[PDB]
Amino acid sequence: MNIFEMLRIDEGLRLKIYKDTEGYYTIGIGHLLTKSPSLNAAKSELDKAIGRNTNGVITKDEAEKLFNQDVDAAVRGILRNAKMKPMYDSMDAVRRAAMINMVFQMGETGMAGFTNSMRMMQQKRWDEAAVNMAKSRWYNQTPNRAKRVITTFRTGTWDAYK
Ligand SMILES: [Cl-]
Ligand SMILES: [Cl-]
Ligand SMILES: [Cl-]
Ligand SMILES: [K+]
């Protein structure tokens, strides 16, 4: 297991534009296109992401390209950040992959409300952090994936993914 295989399992793969749990247009491996309700808008967004006239469908290779870009941007968002960088630096490889999963799904911005739980993590209060983490719109919206993620952060193992 690795961050790519983890996220691939959590995001799934869809070649046609679809709407996530909150109504937002997405495609490929969890690539959010837009928060707009207009499909047309999402379509534009896709052509710009891909660099071609797509009409809402992409190839697997294209999907994987956006995913490389997305994981890279996530890692970068962590690294760039003043509070997250340090938090990332202090974690083992497994917990580092979990945090990257979070950021990919929620962004630097979503991550901000997780400050306390992250801090708990830093203090080795796994269990507490975990319960805390489940108390979020994040978990509530997509509990299965969130449960995997939390488990990973909690334990430092890949059990949730086997
Ligand atoms: Cl993009
Ligand atoms: Cl690529
Ligand atoms: Cl590229
Ligand atoms: K997907």
Swiss-Prot record:
Single GO BP term: defense response to bacterium
A GO CC term attached to the entry: host cell cytoplasm
Reaction(s) catalysed (UniProt annotation): Hydrolysis of (1->4)-beta-linkages between N-acetylmuramic acid and N-acetyl-D-glucosamine residues in a peptidoglycan and between N-acetyl-D-glucosamine residues in chitodextrins
Cell inner membrane is among the record's keywords: no
Subcellular location: Host cytoplasm
UniProt KW keywords: Antimicrobial, Bacteriolytic enzyme, Cytolysis, Glycosidase, Host cell lysis by virus, Host cytoplasm, Hydrolase, Viral release from host cell
Effect of residue 132 to I: 5-fold decrease in enzymatic activity
Upregulation: Expressed late in the viral replication.
Chief place of localization: host cell
PANTHER family: T4-TYPE LYSOZYME 1-RELATED
Protein name: Endolysin
Source lineage: Viruses, Duplodnaviria, Heunggongvirae, Uroviricota, Caudoviricetes
